[PDB]
Amino acid sequence: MDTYYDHQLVGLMVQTATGEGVGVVTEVVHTAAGELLAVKRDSDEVLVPFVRAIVTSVSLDDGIVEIDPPHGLLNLE
C-alpha cells in the first residue's frame, strides 16, 4: 500500500502488467480524482489514470514503472 509521488515518477519507463511497453512517462495530469500518466508512445503519446490500485509495480532506483490500464485506456485519458 505504498504510493510514490507522481511528479517524481514522471520520466520513468512505464508499462502494463501484461508487459506492454507504453513508453517513458514525461508528466502526470492532476485530475479531479487524482492524476494521469502522460507517456511518450513510440510515434505519439497517450494518457492513463495513475492509481495505487491500477499500478502493479514501481521501480524507483531502476527508473521504471509498471501499471495496469483498464481495457484499452492505455491510450489517451
DSSP per residue, 2-34: ----HHHHTTSEEEETT----EEEEE--B-SSS
- Does residue 26 lie within any of the structural domains? yes
- CA-angle at 67, arms to 7 and 21, nearest 5°: 100
User: What is the rounded distance in angstroms from the CA atom of residue 7 to the CA atom of residue 34?
Assistant: 12
Burial class (CB in 10 A: 0-12, 13-18, 19+), 72: exposed
- Could you give the CA distance from residue 59 to residue 23 in angstroms, rounded to a whole number? 14
Solved by what technique? Answer: NMR
Q: Is residue 76 part of a domain?
A: no
The boundaries of the domain holding residue 40 are 6-67
Q: Is 22 domain-assigned?
A: yes
For residue 74, being part of any structural domain is answered with no
Q: Does residue 73 lie within any of the structural domains? A: no
Residue 40 in any domain: the answer is yes
The cell numbers describing 1, all together, are 500500500
Instruction: Give the Cβ contact number of residue 60 at 10 Å.
Output: 11
Q: How far apart (Å, rounded) are the C-alpha atoms in residues 32 and 68?
A: 20
State how many domains the chain has: 1
Q: For residue 30, give the CATH number of its domain.
A: 2.30.30.240
Q: Which residue has the cell 512517462?
A: 25
- Sorted by sequence, the CB contacts under 8 Å of residue 72 that are 6+ apart come out as none
Q: Starting from the edge strand earliest in sequence, which strands make up the sheet with 45-50, in order?
A: 45-50, 35-40, 23-27, 13-16, 64-67, 57-59
